[PDB]
Structures are given as C-alpha cells and as structure tokens.
Design an enzyme around this catalytic site. Structure first.
Site, mmCIF file in Angstrom:
data_model
loop_
_atom_site.group_PDB
_atom_site.id
_atom_site.type_symbol
_atom_site.label_atom_id
_atom_site.label_comp_id
_atom_site.label_asym_id
_atom_site.label_seq_id
_atom_site.Cartn_x
_atom_site.Cartn_y
_atom_site.Cartn_z
ATOM 1 N N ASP A 1 0.930 -1.200 -0.054
ATOM 2 C CA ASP A 1 -0.077 0.008 -0.202
ATOM 3 C C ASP A 1 0.987 1.234 -0.069
ATOM 4 O O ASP A 1 1.734 1.399 0.823
ATOM 5 C CB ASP A 1 -0.932 -0.285 1.178
ATOM 6 C CG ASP A 1 -1.974 1.173 1.326
ATOM 7 O OD1 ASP A 1 -2.276 1.786 0.268
ATOM 8 O OD2 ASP A 1 -2.254 1.626 2.495
ATOM 9 N N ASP B 1 0.916 6.023 -8.145
ATOM 10 C CA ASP B 1 0.594 4.964 -7.376
ATOM 11 C C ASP B 1 0.293 3.836 -8.166
ATOM 12 O O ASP B 1 -0.734 3.445 -8.880
ATOM 13 C CB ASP B 1 -0.840 5.196 -6.528
ATOM 14 C CG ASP B 1 -1.525 4.117 -5.858
ATOM 15 O OD1 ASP B 1 -2.568 3.787 -5.755
ATOM 16 O OD2 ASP B 1 -0.398 3.190 -5.189
#
Length: 373
Positions: free
Chosen positions: A80, A260
């Site tokens: 993450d 991301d």
C-alpha cells in the site's frame, strides 16, 4: 539491492472470474454497436445506478515471501503506497475472516518483543484493530526487528478481507495510520543500515500486466534508460506532486497528481474526464468499470504532464487496450473518474508501464525514467 517480484490482480481480472472472455467481448461489442445507432441523445457515461466504485479503481499487489518472527512464519502481503504500516492477522484474532488466514503467533518466535499499545487503522475498504508488537521481519535476504501491528479484529474490513486472499498489508507510504511513532519499513531499513538508500522503485514490465518488481534500497540501471528526473513532493505524507495536466485540449494547471502503482488506471476528476470522454466518443460499458471506443480512434491524444523542468507523455498506445482480443477493434481507455477533490489525478499502473519510478524518502521526491521494456 533487494527486488521483490509481486503478482498483480486487476478489476478486469476479477470480471473474468465470472464472465467468460467470449460473452464479455460480445457484450461490449454489442453495446458499442447499440451506441452508434440506439440512444440518439446518448453517449452514455454512466448514471447514479451505474457508477465507478473505488474497488473498481484498485489493483492489488501480492507479495507472498515476507516473514515475521525468527521461525519463518509466512504471510501473503499486499503493498500500500498510501501508508507507513505493516500489519499481520494475529493468532489472538477471533474474527470470521481470520479463520482462513495465516495468523501470527508471537509465542513461537524468540525475537518477539511485546508492546501492547492498542490501535486502529482505517483504509478505504475499512478499519482493523489490534495492538503493536515487534519482531524480525524478513524480506528476501533482508531481516530486521520492526514494530508492526498484530490485528485482532477485521470485522470492519469485510467483505473484502474474506474475499481477497491476503493476510496483511505492508506500507510503502509515509503516513502512520495509528498516528503512533511508526516509520515505514523502508525508512527503518535505512535507519538500521540494512539498505543503502531510503528509497524504493517500481518496474512494471510492459509485456506482463500481471507482474511487477519492487526494488528496495537502490536503483537498478537495468530497469531504465536515459536519465531519472525528480519531482518534489507537494505533500509531507503522500507520493504526490504538482503537474500541469494536458488531456488533448483539456488542461488543468498545477494539479495534484498522486503516483500509485496500486491504482488500476489514470484517474481524473469526473467533470474533467466525462468531458474528455464526451469528445472522443468514448462510452461506458453499463454495469462494468470499463470505458471503450475504437482502438484506432483518430482523436485520442498524447497525455502530457508538465512540471517546471520536465515533461512526461503518455501516448494513446499506453492507455488503450483491446478488450481482450489482442486484435484491436474496440479498446478500453485506461482512465477512470475518481473525485478526491477538484484538483487531483492519479498516475496508476498504465503510466508506470512506460515510466520506471523512484520513490525517494531522503530526497522527498518521485523520480521518473523511460522504463527499459
């Protein structure tokens, strides 16, 4: 420099679990055909009863060789980039989801050091609670004592937890969600001289959508060509930077752009994108998180992301995929509307298939380079 190979699962893959390739192709094809004739005042881009959900925006990055404890307890982790925390489901966990997981048992590891501080941490898919413990975390040839969270309650993380085959999460971000004094493991690894530099990189092979490589500690010349250009974070706690975004004639100056690999597409604020889509004659497939048009759509521009000193582009071929048929008739556009605010975009997987990226904690910046293949 440690390089962790990880597997990637996308919403599209999820879709294929239930729909056959065959009917998915025909459903889409027959849908587009309907749009080029059917609903005149059409050009469907969804509705209040057909929306893009955040689960339709996330890739999951699975790495299953990390260990906790001096007895080799194995866990399936997911990365993450939005948080600093590591957590594994605890042996003390009595939740339903925990019955199918690899549970951490501190009593079997003689490097375990009790802490006990209670905490809760929230992800977009829900909250988990547990307490802090400290033990050996091994990642490849790297090993060090590291404070992590032992999760005992995962009820608020359903239905995701029992639906996805992961045990815990390893943070590649900055923010400690327990607002404890926790450093990301990468920084800690640097703090203990396990690695040369507090940074890591992502290399996402253009040829293998299901694969990715996370390198920790240093930059491998083999992943990129030309030079790496750096961009200063515009935020203390997220891999986020300022860029002027150009989607053809569409422009947004000084946008906030999150980088991301965890995100499945390029994301944009819904107005900006719906607009974008409304010119290209792109449609949303009803009930599916996909946007499609002709692979050889003449009007599809090269996206541009500019800073003071640099320009990054994303040519049509990097954000358009044949619906499954390597044969390009209809294509999905790898862009999804996501409203975080009026200003925020995410450069997800597709951008990173072209650009090799560096996430440097010391320099507080993201580095960009043309990825070697």
């Amino acid at each position: 420099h440690l390089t962790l190979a990880f597997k990637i699962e996308r919403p599209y893959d999820k879709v294929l679990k239930t729909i056959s390739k065959k009917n998915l192709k025909n459903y889409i094809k027959e849908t587009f055909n309907f749009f080029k004739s059917g609903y005149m005042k059409q050009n469907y881009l969804g509705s209040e009863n057909d929306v893009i959900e955040l689960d339709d925006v996330a890739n999951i990055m699975f790495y299953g060789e990390g260990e906790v404890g001096d007895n080799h307890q194995k866990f399936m982790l997911i990365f993450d980039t939005g948080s600093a925390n590591l957590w594994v489901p605890s042996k003390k966990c009595n939740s339903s989801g925990c019955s199918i997981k690899n549970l951490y048992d501190s009593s079997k590891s003689k490097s375990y050091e009790k802490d006990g501080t209670k905490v809760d941490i929230t992800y977009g898919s829900g909250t988990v609670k547990g307490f802090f413990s400290k033990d050996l975390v091994t990642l490849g040839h790297l090993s060090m004592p590291y404070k992590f969270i032992e999760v005992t309650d995962t009820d608020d993380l359903e239905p995701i937890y029992s639906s996805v085959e992961f045990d815990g999460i390893l943070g590649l971000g900055w923010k400690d969600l327990s607002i404890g004094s926790i450093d990301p493991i990468v920084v800690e690894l640097k703090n203990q001289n396990k690695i040369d530099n507090a940074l890591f990189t992502f290399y996402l092979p253009v040829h293998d959508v299901h694969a990715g490589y996370l390198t920790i500690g240093g930059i491998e010349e083999k992943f990129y060509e030309g030079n790496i250009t750096y961009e200063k974070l515009n935020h203390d706690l997220y891999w986020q930077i300022d860029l002027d975004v150009h989607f053809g004639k569409q422009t947004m100056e000084k946008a906030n752009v999150i980088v991301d690999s965890g995100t499945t597409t390029i994301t944009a604020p819904s107005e900006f994108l719906n607009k974008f889509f409304a010119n290209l004659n792109v449609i949303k497939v009803p009930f599916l998180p996909f946007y499609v048009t002709t692979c050889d759509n003449k009007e599809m521009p090269t996206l541009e992301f500019k800073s003071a000193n640099n320009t990054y582009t994303l040519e049509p071929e990097y954000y358009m995929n044949p619906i499954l048929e390597v044969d390009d008739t209809l294509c999905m556009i790898t862009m999804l509307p996501v409203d975080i605010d009026s200003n925020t975009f995410i450069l997800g997987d597709p951008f990173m298939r072209k650009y090799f990226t560096v996430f440097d904690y010391d320099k507080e910046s993201v580095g960009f380079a043309i990825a070697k293949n």
